[PDB]
């Protein structure tokens, strides 16, 4: 389940396709918790491609549903990334992940 809450500006037509290296200013957030990851900190805005299962399903499905300039807000379910397993130290099991996702991409 990928629930999109878009902050309005963008173009609404430049959608990511397969094999397109796309650039996202992501900002992670735990529900009722602090941050855990941010591209604003490293200032290397995570040039990743679409269709190789590199990113999690709650972030990959949110990327194709956005366009250039758009600023959505992810609500990632636990069972797509870390709900059963959980990362040691960062993301616990059964965690509902929140992301501040803006798609200012290339290709």
Numbering used by the authors: 1 to 107
Sentences from the paper on this structure:
Ca2+, ATP, and caffeine are well-characterized activators of RyR, synergistically activating the channel by inducing a rotation of its activation core and pore opening. Broadly speaking, conformational changes along CC1 involve the cytoplasmic shell, the activation core, and the pore; those along CC2 involve only the cytoplasmic shell.
The rapid decrease in conformational energy and binding affinity between states 2 and 3 implies minimal protein conformational changes during the Ca2+ association. Information from at least six structures along the functional route on the energy landscapes was needed to identify a thermally accessible pathway by MD-based piecewise free-energy simulations (see “Methods”).
